Design a binder for these strands. Sequence first.
DNA 1: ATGTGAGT
DNA 2: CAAACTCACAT
Length: 327
Amino acid sequence: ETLNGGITDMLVELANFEKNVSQAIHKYNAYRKAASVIAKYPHKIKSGAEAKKLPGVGTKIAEKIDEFLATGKLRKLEKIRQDDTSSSINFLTRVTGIGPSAARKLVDEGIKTLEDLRKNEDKLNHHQRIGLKYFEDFEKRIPREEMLQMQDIVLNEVKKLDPEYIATVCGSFRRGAESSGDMDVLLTHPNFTSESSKQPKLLHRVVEQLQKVRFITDTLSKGETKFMGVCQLPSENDENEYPHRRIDIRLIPKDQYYCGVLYFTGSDIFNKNMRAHALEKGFTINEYTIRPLGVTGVAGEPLPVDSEQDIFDYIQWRYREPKDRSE
DNA sequence: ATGTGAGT
DNA sequence: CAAACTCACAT
Ligand SMILES: [Cl-]
Ligand SMILES: [Cl-]
Ligand SMILES: [Cl-]
Ligand SMILES: [Cl-]
Ligand code: NA
Ligand code: NA
Ligand code: NA
Ligand code: NA
Ligand code: NA
Ligand code: NA
Ligand code: NA
Ligand code: NA
């Protein structure tokens, strides 16, 4: 499926429009849910009325489906795609920190392009100015090779700080991807657990260190548990400077760390299959904890975890290398 | 204290 | 994966 892709693409495009251009949250979700229930449907849809049988597909989407099936297009959508305001809003919204709200306010004031934004930084917050500054860099893919260099700096700086620190770079990179959008590091320390006294300094000290060595270059945000900023590989002497990259560093309690590393290594299909097989065996898995599931169905109290291996063991699956976590 | 916003 | 959850900024 496959089957009804044209209709689902149609609705995903209507959703985006309602979220990013109207600011009608309920219509956005209405379209998301409709696109989802349709993508699950086993038959090639032939009428709006057939789709209307599906929960979440109502009168109005049935009408649109009818037009789409008849002509292969949707007038509403062709108008949206020709609309400059909509195009501009979607463009601005590609700057990190700029979402639909700021986007409206900016296009309303005639600010629509990168050049335009760079002439109106007084209109932007810190996050958004960082996003404009590295707009091009942040849109480049990161090759595995640089990801690997980056991974070493943080893993090394972290070790030399405190050998008890555990730091892991996750996402598709961890599954062996050839390129990456950004770097998502999960961090923990054995004297930081869920039953303990909350220690921001654990994160802050490694952020500060990565700033000392001039690896972290800008901060988008930094709280007690979550850091989001910008990094840059060092360039030798003069010559060509590396592009600035997005990096997040998240501090997780030690007793929830590996569910974290698992959840955030993906893939989504692999997670879905994993947390669904876990149901079959009688356990619920989220990003934090794996818990058993009683006869009633509702149950809790987390099981002790100290590796990804453990989680696999609980649900009676052989361990799967991150390389093999496609599905 | 609360609400809006943004990103993951 | 949507939803939840962090954090920034305002008032
Ligand atoms: Cl202007
Ligand atoms: Cl501002
Ligand atoms: Cl990579
Ligand atoms: Cl995983
Ligand atoms: Na808007
Ligand atoms: Na709905
Ligand atoms: Na009904
Ligand atoms: Na409609
Ligand atoms: Na963005
Ligand atoms: Na100005
Ligand atoms: Na990543
Ligand atoms: Na943050």
